[PDB]
Motif scaffolding. Structure first.
Motif, short mmCIF file in Angstrom:
data_model
loop_
_atom_site.label_atom_id
_atom_site.label_comp_id
_atom_site.label_asym_id
_atom_site.label_seq_id
_atom_site.Cartn_x
_atom_site.Cartn_y
_atom_site.Cartn_z
N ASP A 41 9.87 13.49 -11.66
CA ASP A 41 10.21 13.23 -13.09
C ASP A 41 9.00 12.66 -13.86
O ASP A 41 8.87 11.45 -13.98
CB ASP A 41 11.44 12.32 -13.09
N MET A 42 8.17 13.53 -14.37
CA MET A 42 6.96 13.17 -15.12
C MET A 42 7.27 12.42 -16.42
O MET A 42 6.47 11.55 -16.81
CB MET A 42 6.07 14.36 -15.37
N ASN A 43 8.39 12.71 -17.04
CA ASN A 43 8.84 12.07 -18.27
C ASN A 43 9.16 10.59 -18.08
O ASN A 43 9.09 9.82 -19.07
CB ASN A 43 10.11 12.78 -18.84
N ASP A 92 -1.78 12.72 -16.56
CA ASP A 92 -2.23 13.64 -15.50
C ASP A 92 -2.31 12.89 -14.17
O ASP A 92 -2.76 11.76 -14.12
CB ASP A 92 -3.57 14.30 -15.86
N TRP A 93 -1.86 13.57 -13.13
CA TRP A 93 -1.87 12.99 -11.76
C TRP A 93 -2.41 14.06 -10.81
O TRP A 93 -1.85 15.18 -10.79
CB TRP A 93 -0.43 12.65 -11.33
N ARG A 94 -3.41 13.70 -10.06
CA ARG A 94 -3.95 14.67 -9.06
C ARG A 94 -2.93 14.70 -7.90
O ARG A 94 -2.39 13.67 -7.50
CB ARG A 94 -5.28 14.22 -8.51
N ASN A 129 5.04 6.33 -15.47
CA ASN A 129 4.23 5.36 -16.16
C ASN A 129 2.76 5.80 -15.94
O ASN A 129 2.22 5.55 -14.87
CB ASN A 129 4.49 3.93 -15.74
N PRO A 130 2.20 6.40 -16.97
CA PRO A 130 0.81 6.87 -16.94
C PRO A 130 -0.11 5.86 -16.31
O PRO A 130 0.05 4.66 -16.53
CB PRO A 130 0.49 7.17 -18.40
N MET A 131 -1.06 6.34 -15.53
CA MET A 131 -2.05 5.53 -14.83
C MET A 131 -1.43 4.42 -14.01
O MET A 131 -2.16 3.49 -13.67
CB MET A 131 -3.03 4.89 -15.83
N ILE A 184 0.89 -1.17 0.00
CA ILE A 184 0.00 0.00 0.00
C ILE A 184 0.93 1.22 0.00
O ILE A 184 1.94 1.16 0.73
CB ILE A 184 -0.93 0.01 1.26
N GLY A 185 0.66 2.23 -0.77
CA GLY A 185 1.51 3.41 -0.86
C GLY A 185 1.66 3.88 -2.30
O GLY A 185 1.23 3.25 -3.27
N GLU A 186 2.26 5.04 -2.41
CA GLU A 186 2.53 5.74 -3.66
C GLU A 186 3.60 5.02 -4.47
O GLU A 186 4.78 5.06 -4.10
CB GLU A 186 3.03 7.14 -3.35
N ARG A 187 3.12 4.39 -5.53
CA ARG A 187 4.04 3.64 -6.43
C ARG A 187 4.94 4.67 -7.11
O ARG A 187 4.41 5.63 -7.67
CB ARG A 187 3.26 2.87 -7.49
N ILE A 188 6.22 4.48 -6.99
CA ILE A 188 7.21 5.33 -7.60
C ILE A 188 8.41 4.53 -8.11
O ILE A 188 8.73 3.44 -7.66
CB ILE A 188 7.76 6.49 -6.66
N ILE A 189 9.00 5.16 -9.12
CA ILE A 189 10.24 4.59 -9.70
C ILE A 189 11.33 5.57 -9.24
O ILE A 189 11.03 6.79 -9.33
CB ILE A 189 10.16 4.63 -11.27
N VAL A 190 12.44 5.08 -8.79
CA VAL A 190 13.54 6.01 -8.41
C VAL A 190 14.67 5.66 -9.42
O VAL A 190 15.14 4.50 -9.38
CB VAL A 190 13.98 5.86 -6.94
N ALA A 191 15.01 6.62 -10.23
CA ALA A 191 16.09 6.36 -11.21
C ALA A 191 17.00 7.56 -11.26
O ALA A 191 16.67 8.65 -10.73
CB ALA A 191 15.44 6.08 -12.58
#
Ligand SMILES: O=C(O)c1ccc(O)[n+]([O-])c1
Ligand SMILES: O=C(O)c1ccc(O)[n+]([O-])c1
Ligand SMILES: O=C(O)c1ccc(O)[n+]([O-])c1
Ligand SMILES: O=C(O)c1ccc(O)[n+]([O-])c1
Ligand SMILES: [C-]#N
Ligand SMILES: [C-]#N
Ligand SMILES: [C-]#N
Ligand SMILES: [C-]#N
Ligand SMILES: [Fe+3]
Ligand SMILES: [Fe+3]
Ligand SMILES: [Fe+3]
Ligand SMILES: [Fe+3]
Lengths: 200, 233, 233, 200, 233, 200, 200
Positions: B206-208, C152-154, B211-213, B71-78
């Motif tokens: 880093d929005m670029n 887009d991300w809220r 991974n959308p959705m 549970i938590g904010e899925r993030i990629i750290v690169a």
């Protein structure tokens, strides 16, 4: 003057360093391969020894959350950089102090001699890096052996330490643990008998 | 075996945190009082281990599956690992560890009341590629209350360990997240005297790379000591 | 019954978001094209319901126990409700709803891959006290990906509904968290043209209200339309 | 000129408004007391009626995630502000459109007459506030009844609408649902036959 | 008896003077080397004495009459005591002590060559009113030379002791006079690192509170730790 | 984040603190009512004790201009906040060390047990605040009793001190003066055996 | 956050786009090799079809200066990126509407099924980009076939369109021209029946 990109700043390892670098200690399941405290396999050439010690803070109390990394040459005085669990000997290792006793152990072989940049031989030694909560940047030190007196006297590194009394802090004391040759190396971070720490 | 070919840029001990930084209580008793003894670089210091042959598990770098989904904010750290000269550091070992979404660590000694996540361990490792790039997948950790001042809270952070080419470059640090209001308040962060250095530890959204959705991403580049060839020695 | 004693400060439709804000796609088809018809205030508009007698549950305002403990950053959200004149709004109904730590809502229609938290519902309500103060206890929600632009991300946000004294003051809004890098990027946030107005929606970290070694706190004050007495009508 | 503190800005309710304001609809367990669509108990004085309608966007498609709040006087033309589930009649209510049919329902009683600030009587009416995803700030409207023609003609509010054709958009149509008197009130947010929305 | 109903804002130890400020020679041997141990607030810490029934003499707050008329500049020192939330602290004990017009204290250990004033003692005490107001009548003290550096002079000052609601709020400080050139030169003053904090110790000339053809007045407000009710404990 | 008004900064009490807080000691006439070192009237319930000690600087030299304030619960573990010279027992007191011998004394009763915010009982203790020349901001400490060993072991406060050796510094050593129960409590501000100081 | 170089901003193709991209149409001599409207050589595998349509503005007026580019998979659902006038089949093509009749045409084969990033198959489609005077940035659309109803119902792309009525706008209506299978695909840029345009 010229300026390069600035090095990323250091930060303490924190008290939970173990979750990341010493899984067993954290009391977490380990992975297939882990970098631990056994540099030499029983079948490794050289004199097998056990290294053990304690870490003390400025008040004389044990540092029970310390993390150590070691770098040493093999019996032949050669740095074995290709790290592999298959190796009979690895020049690199990791250890940590017990939350109870507060003692670290390392199973290795006494390192052979290596020369400095100017071609002068340095007494057998183990390079140590110490990390822990309260330490903003890791501390560098060297472990020398008390039975290598002749060598120690001539070491170009040891001789840079201005005060002879301070050199003594880098010398591990020979002992026997379960009838096995061992060397005890206690680290006093601050105060009386404070261990020499290097910058390189 | 390894060989004495390199020299490393001398560390700037004024950039890095000092040993004694009183707001961070534990440093009082765990900091030397004698000056460090400067020594010239030799083979002992200019070499280090190579982890190319270490047996890495399939999900060593994926905290989302290496331990149900956390549970938590899925993030990629690169990010990338370069030296002071801008030169990439290929095949280097990167290790990271963190608390869960709530700020609880999967460690014996952690007694914080936030619950553990049955599907989260908190450890990752990976080797940088030929271009010095690394990437991990995890959840964004939460702030953690600790016994320092009466109301101290660590900003959300991830612990990092990077090997580099020698024991001379080995570094342990922490990543902070862009815009975290807790940052400027932390005594650990504040151990660093130069605000420009503090900026080096903040990962930028880093929005670029997101991974959308699916998950967002953070960029964290690390700079290790410059490596030069010896000359006229 | 209620009575026509008050007049309310006319809304500034230039402060609030406009109806048509194209970056926020759904507004295209859900915004009127004809101008609103201005009408004078009457009893119909100057009165509203009083929730003083509503039967509130013991944990109505405690998202940590109102649904095992939820995984996520324990936070208290508190603040006060005043009118344009600075006058507090006692015994007013405040309702809030949010996603979990991962950004998943406990709603049928939400298909985001982040998991639900077995111990988290996401709804709270409470009445403001005599001084116009309210407080809730929850976990900090995560950012949520949505079908607007391709990526887009809220920003992390909590939905708020406040009654006030009349139907004229009733408001629905959203709270954002200080320093969130996603804020300035959101088309929903950006529906608001004045950056000063955007600032009104960001809750500020409140260390003074935090519970040491327990949970952090955020301050969010809400301002409702000014209420004046009629004169020379 | 003088300036007051600025009102907190509005934001859309979002598609999940139901988790917070219409629990049942979200498909979540409700609490002991909930503010819903039943303003009148069977034993409430006045003529019991059923209100129903649909919400349309600019393309003529149904808005299935809309949330509505209503405020009306009782049969005697009195606003009952003390909200309580014990009450035989509550002046306040909430409803939402079904994700399927996209229709809202309200069970109430036809409101009695109330005078405006200048003492002029306003035709029976229900005050409506509409919220939903895509709506940045809620929309205000009034529901008038087609069988109150005489009253409607004289309403000071209805008469502010410049174009007579636009007034027609606020008139609910009498019908029967399960042999019960009902009034249908469809909301066209944008376009052809777009409902009059007020600012006050 | 007293009750554990309050919590007090955590002190800002970077606002207050640090323990070791070497220019103030005596702090060298009188400052702890170990870090303070933070503890949670309990009834022990959130309660303190109430001096409402202390039998104050008639001239307890009037240094002109409580010890012939003293020689020196006749002034009134008045102000208000509020907490960090700006709330008044009623019925609190304020005690003050100071040297005479020439900088001589009426104390055994004071060997300064300026003579004592036969009509002056230099001690006052009083209780703040319902509104948190206090007031004293005294004479403006003189600078005093002290053995710190070879030519150190304390600016003219008045020692103050304030109890507040609990032992957590109790404070001892010093009041300085607006425009005194000695202020910026004093090592005790300089123990305070933020110049903004120093400003809070300067009493401003208050012409509106002055008694024409009689005495001048100085205004000195005091702020004690903010008190708040416990929540979600 | 949010910011409140900043608290008025502390300043040293100075060497002449006595003139204002320990009149007698300054060698000045006292006032009718003074706050002093006798918390308990001989007829107060509980176990009457005499407390005394010295205060040492980092050089091990006596601090003879020190000023102390104390706060404790009565024999029933209750805090008597309404201060009055009439009461048989007062929770608040003041003391100071002699310009000569450099010793402070206090006449009270042994405090009963109080619970912490969590409801866990704390060992009997006296809260002490120390002020003096060279002390920029006063130091907070606690006085525990050597004969309450069982309680001390379980005190939630005492337990927050990481190193057990540091806990001992807060334990007063029982004795007898003039056939009266006495507890000696020495304060070492700096150095070897430095007393634990708190922040709250 | 992180920022890359900004992409070069789009500009309208202008009324004379033909001079550069549809030589013939400008009424200018062509070059040896031109990219045109014939994707398939008569001997190409798959079902040969003729596509045609008109482009309408918001007033329902024909857009006679429009320029289109197409991208599709071959009959096997493969994208042939190596463009060559020799190949029997090319995935890429260009067309434009007549200054007179205002109709565009394309000679190709019906595309086979391709899967999306998730591995779900998409109904057979043609990707279209529309450029023209008054179009600041080109519009992206897809052409689906009315005779692939079963597939269309399950297309993950088609399914992203909220309103089912809007999906119909992407379906080409089968017919026959000169006894050849034809599909008519009209584009309504604005207004009643406005065609779905995409962002990716
Ligand atoms: O005491 C410390 O140094 C500490 C405590 C917690 C934490 O998370 N980190 O990183 C460091
Ligand atoms: O479409 C919207 O308006 C929307 C979607 C998600 C979300 O969380 N909020 O708040 C709003
Ligand atoms: O040594 C000191 O701390 C000192 C000396 C004189 C004085 O007036 N005050 O306030 C303080
Ligand atoms: O109408 C237009 O869009 C236009 C007209 C002339 C021209 O040269 N360009 O580029 C564009
Ligand atoms: C942090 N450990
Ligand atoms: C958002 N619902
Ligand atoms: C002043 N002492
Ligand atoms: C240019 N067309
Ligand atoms: Fe940590
Ligand atoms: Fe939302
Ligand atoms: Fe003084
Ligand atoms: Fe042109």
């Amino acid at each position: 003057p010229i300026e390069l990109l600035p090095e990323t700043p250091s930060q303490t390892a924190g008290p939970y360093v173990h979750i990341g670098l010493a899984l067993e200690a954290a009391g977490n399941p380990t992975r297939d391969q882990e970098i631990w405290n056994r540099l030499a396999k029983p079948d490794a050439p050289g004199e097998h020894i056990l290294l053990l010690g304690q870490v003390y803070d400025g008040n004389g109390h044990l540092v029970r959350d310390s993390f150590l990394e070691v770098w040493q040459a093999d019996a032949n005085g050669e740095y074995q950089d290709a790290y592999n669990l298959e190796n009979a000997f690895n020049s690199f290792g990791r250890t940590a102090t017990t939350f109870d006793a507060g003692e670290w152990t390392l199973h290795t072989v006494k390192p052979g001699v290596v020369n400095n940049a100017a071609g002068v031989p340095m007494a057998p030694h183990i390079n140590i890096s110490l990390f822990a909560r309260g330490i903003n940047i890791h501390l560098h030190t060297r472990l020398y052996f008390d039975d290598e007196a002749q060598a120690n006297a001539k070491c170009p590194v040891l001789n840079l330490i201005e005060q002879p009394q301070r050199r003594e802090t880098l010398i591990a004391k020979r002992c026997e643990v379960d009838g096995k040759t061992a060397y005890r190396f206690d680290i006093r971070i601050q105060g009386e008998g404070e261990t020499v720490f290097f910058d390189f | 075996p390894a060989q004495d070919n390199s020299r490393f840029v001398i560390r700037d001990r004024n950039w890095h945190p000092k040993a004694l930084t009183p707001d961070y209580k534990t440093s009082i008793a765990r900091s030397p009082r004698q000056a460090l003894v400067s020594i010239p670089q030799s083979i002992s210091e200019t070499t280090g281990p190579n982890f190319s042959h270490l047996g890495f598990g399939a999900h060593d770098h994926d905290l989302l599956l290496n331990f149900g989904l956390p549970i938590g904010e899925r993030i990629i750290v690169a990010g990338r690992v370069v030296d002071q000269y801008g030169k990439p550091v290929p095949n280097t070992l990167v290790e990271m560890w963190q608390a869960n979404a709530g700020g609880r660590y999967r460690h014996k000694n952690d007694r914080y009341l936030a619950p553990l996540d049955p599907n989260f361990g908190g450890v990752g490792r990976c080797l940088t590629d030929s271009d010095g790039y690394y990437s991990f997948r995890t959840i964004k950790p939460g702030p953690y209350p600790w016994r320092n001042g009466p109301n101290d809270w660590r900003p959300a952070h991830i612990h990092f360990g990077i090997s580099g080419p020698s024991i001379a470059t080995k570094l342990i640090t922490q990543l902070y997240f862009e815009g975290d209001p807790l940052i400027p308040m932390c005594p650990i962060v504040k151990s660093i005297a130069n605000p420009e250095a503090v900026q080096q530890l903040i990962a930028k959204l880093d929005m670029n790379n997101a991974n959308p959705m699916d998950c967002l991403a953070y960029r964290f580049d690390i700079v290790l000591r410059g490596q030069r060839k010896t000359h006229f020695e």
